[PDB]
Amino acid sequence: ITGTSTVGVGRGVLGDQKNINTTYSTYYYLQDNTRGNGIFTYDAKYRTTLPGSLWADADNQFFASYDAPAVDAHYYAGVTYDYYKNVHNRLSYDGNNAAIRSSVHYSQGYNNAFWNGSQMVYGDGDGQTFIPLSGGIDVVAHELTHAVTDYTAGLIYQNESGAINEAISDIFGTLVEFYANKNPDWEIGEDVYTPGISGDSLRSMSDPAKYGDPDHYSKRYTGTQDNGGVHINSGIINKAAYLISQGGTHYGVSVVGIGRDKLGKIFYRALTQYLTPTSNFSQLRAAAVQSATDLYGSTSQEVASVKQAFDAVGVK
Numbered sequence: 483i484t485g486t487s488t489v490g491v492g493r494g495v496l497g498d499q500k501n502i503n504t505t506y507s508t509y510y511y512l513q514d515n516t517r518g519n520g521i522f523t524y525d526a527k528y529r530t531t532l533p534g535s536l537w538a539d540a541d542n543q544f545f546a547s548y549d550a551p552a553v554d555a556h557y558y559a560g561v562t563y564d565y566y567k568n569v570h571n572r573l574s575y576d577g578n579n580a581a582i583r584s585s586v587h588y589s590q591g592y593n594n595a596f597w598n599g600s601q602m603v604y605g606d607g608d609g610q611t612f613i614p615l616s617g618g619i620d621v622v623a624h625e626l627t628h629a630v631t632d633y634t635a636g637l638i639y640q641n642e643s644g645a646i647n648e649a650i651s652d653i654f655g656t657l658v659e660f661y662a663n664k665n666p667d668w669e670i671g672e673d674v675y676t677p678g679i680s681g682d683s684l685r686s687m688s689d690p691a692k693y694g695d696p697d698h699y700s701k702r703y704t705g706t707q708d709n710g711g712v713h714i715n716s717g718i719i720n721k722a723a724y725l726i727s728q729g730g731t732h733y734g735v736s737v738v739g740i741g742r743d744k745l746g747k748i749f750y751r752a753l754t755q756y757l758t759p760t761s762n763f764s765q766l767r768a769a770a771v772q773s774a775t776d777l778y779g780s781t782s783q784e785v786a787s788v789k790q791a792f793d794a795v796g797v798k
């Protein structure tokens with residue numbers, strides 16, 4: 483809508499206070515005009531019809547518990563935009579500042595979030611498995627990264643290409659979590675998963691097997707569930723990414739870490755220059771080695787660490 487840019491205040495899912503960019507026109511709307519063609523947040527009103535109605539508020543204060551998931555979806559989309567812009571010189575998910583849209587309060591007791599090809603969508607969770615999913619910055623960033631992937635490599639959501647697609651979203655979700663410096667870790671979804679249980683998460687990048695995901699290519703899932711295990715075999719790549727950044731010894735193979743910033747640069751280049759819709763794990767390795775070579779030279783420590791990491795998880 484057309485109106486005046488202003489700034490409101492609210493409380494997120496975890497009870498933290500934050501400022502959010504809104505637009506004034508009779509009502510205050512969750513519309514951020516400061517980033518690209520805008521960030522727009524919608525109320526799906528417990529239904530499944532999308533996008534719902536652009537979020538309207540009477541006083542520019544968002545402290546109702548109903549408001550919380552909207553606050554976080556709106557705010558964290560903003561942070562994710564900033565990350566891609568400031569760190570990788572990318573303007574929104576399409577590279578041309580496309581408007582970013584999210585709907586919250588999707589369905590009832592819905593334990594999921596997704597990119598539907600056009601926008602992000604967040605359930606409120608059932609209160610046991612999940613609380614509202616936009617409360618996790620690694621969740622929001624994971625979802626927006628699916629959009630980035632769809633506009634660049636276009637990795638098919640199936641088998642090995644799909645697992646790469648998933649890992650890319652976990653990797654960048656995590657890098658965005660570190661960027662915002664919000665209790666960063668190498669775990670996925672910890673802030674919104676099982677509110678009754680401390681210290682757990684949905685997935686782990688540092689140790690995927692902790693939650694039954696493979697940390698080695700020999701342990702990959704070869705069945706048909708989960709589109710050929712896209713959320714399972716991603717563990718293999720997640721572990722490789724963890725090793726490149728942090729270093730360590732895995733199945734007897736030692737890796738010197740090169741840190742988060744270089745990890746991000748290598749994988750962003752691979753994603754945007756070398757991966758294709760049908761890339762498999764072995765092609766990912768090649769893309770990553772070539773990217774590091776491009777950036778740091780073929781005899782660099784960087785190239786060496788990328789090679790050691792993929793060796794450690796058994797990807798040749």
Ligand SMILES: O=C(O)C[C@H](NC(=O)OCc1ccccc1)C(=O)O
Nearest residue numbers: 594595596597620621624670671684
């Ligand atoms: O399969 C899909 O496309 C939807 C799936 N969504 C999903 O797993 O929602 C929960 C969640 C998301 C990110 C991080 C932690 C938890 C996905 O995005 O991978």
Ligand SMILES: [Ca+2]
Nearest residue numbers: 539541543544
């Ligand atoms: Ca209000």
Ligand SMILES: [Ca+2]
Nearest residue numbers: 664665666667
């Ligand atoms: Ca965290």
Ligand SMILES: [Ca+2]
Nearest residue numbers: 620669670671
């Ligand atoms: Ca995390």
Ligand SMILES: [Ca+2]
Nearest residue numbers: 675676677679
């Ligand atoms: Ca928990």
Ligand SMILES: [Zn+2]
Nearest residue numbers: 624628648651
């Ligand atoms: Zn995903």
